[PDB]
C-alpha cells in the first residue's frame, strides 16, 4: 500500500 507499512490483498 504506497506510503504505509500496511498490507492489502491484490485484486484479480
Amino acid at each position: 500500500v504506497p506510503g504505509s507499512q500496511h498490507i492489502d490483498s491484490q485484486k484479480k
Epitope: 500500500v1 504506497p2 506510503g3 504505509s4 507499512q5 500496511h6 491484490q10 485484486k11
Partner: antibody, heavy 116, light 113 residues
Framework: QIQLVQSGPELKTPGETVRISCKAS????????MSWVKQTPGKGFKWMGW????????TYADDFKGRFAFSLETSASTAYLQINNLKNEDTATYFC?????????WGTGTTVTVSS | DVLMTQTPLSLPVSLGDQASISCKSS???????????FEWYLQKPGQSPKLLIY???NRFSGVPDRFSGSGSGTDFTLKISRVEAEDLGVYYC?????????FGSGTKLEIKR
Amino acid sequence: QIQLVQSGPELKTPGETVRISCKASGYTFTTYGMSWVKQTPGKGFKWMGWINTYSGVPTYADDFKGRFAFSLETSASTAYLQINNLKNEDTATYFCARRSWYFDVWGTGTTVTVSS
Amino acid sequence: DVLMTQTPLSLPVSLGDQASISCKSSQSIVHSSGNTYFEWYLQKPGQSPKLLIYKVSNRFSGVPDRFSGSGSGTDFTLKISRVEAEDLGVYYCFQGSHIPFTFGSGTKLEIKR
C-alpha cells in the same frame, strides 16, 4: 485516545533552519507509516513524502528532495521534519499524518512564516 | 504526476438537499495491485482534515451514512444526501496509488439558509 500533537508557529528569517516535532500518543508508533504534507495558504495541499517508522527509511517526493529531512525518535514516539536554508516559499502549515489504508489521524499543524 | 481536478470550486446547497462533488484524475489511479487508494477529506476552518471515504466507496468509522462515494479509474464523485449545517468545510480528494500522492484543489460547501 490517539493524538498527533505538533510544535507551535515558528517565525523564521530566510536561510534559517526549522525542526517541527510530531509526537504520537495512544498507539504504537512503529506500526503506521508517517507522512508530512504542506498546505499553502490559498494554493492547497502538496504531499512531501513519508518515513516508515519501523525501518527508519525516508521517501522524499521529487520537489522536496534536498533541504528536507524526516527523522525519528522512536523511544519518544516523535517524528521530525527539518527544513534547511529556508526559502520564503516555505511559508505554510505542515502536517504529519498517520497512514494505514488512509490518513485517519492528522497532526494539529505547525505554521512556519519565513520573512525578512 | 496524476493531476486531480475537482468540480465545483464552491457549492451552495440548501439544508436537507443532496450534493455531489466530482474529481477527475489525469491518468488511472488503480494501483498495480488492482486496489484504488482513493479518499475524500473534509477540513473545517481552523481544523485538521477529516477522513470521510477511502478506497473509493468505504465510509470510515463514525461517518454518517448520508455520505457516500463512487467512481472508477479516473472519475469519482462524493455525494452528501441531506446536507446538515455541520457539513460546512472544504472537501478534497486524494489519490494514494501513484507516487507522488496528489490532492484536489478542494470544493467549498456553502449552506443556503
